[PDB]
């Protein structure tokens, strides 16, 4: 659920999942459309797509458990939906960390009309 993902993001990047990553670019937020603005926005688009592959799962509210193996994010065994939601989130947290150097504040609270074009998952 959102509580596990937010804690995951804070641990990995040092930044609070709100506000940094809830209104960033074209895909860090709610839904999304258009062409991702930068590497961090692509992390969100890939994250959205990953959730997209789990139709009878509820990613935002279904809680899972994960542990740290010295820095590594190991998803704990849970229901089949929890395991898969955890892997989509771990991937996003790592992707955000991988692109911290290009994170740009000018993409925070990005207007909707500038999100143009199309990208299929």
């Amino acid at each position: 659920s959102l509580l596990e993902f937010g804690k995951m993001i804070l641990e990995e990047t040092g930044k609070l999942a709100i506000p940094s990553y809830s209104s960033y670019g074209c895909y860090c937020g709610w839904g999304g459309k258009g062409t991702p603005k930068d590497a961090t926005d692509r992390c969100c688009f890939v994250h959205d797509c990953c959730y997209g592959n789990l139709p009878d799962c509820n990613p935002k509210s279904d809680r899972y458990k994960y542990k740290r193996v010295n820095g590594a994010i190991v998803c704990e065994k849970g229901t089949s939906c929890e395991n898969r939601i955890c892997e989509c989130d771990k991937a996003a947290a790592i992707c955000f960390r991988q692109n911290l150097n290009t994170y740009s504040k000018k993409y925070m609270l990005y207007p909707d009309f500038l999100c143009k074009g199309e990208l299929k998952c």
Partner: peptide
């Protein structure tokens, strides 16, 4: 922690 993405 809190929430989004």
């Amino acid at each position: 922690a809190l929430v989004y993405k």
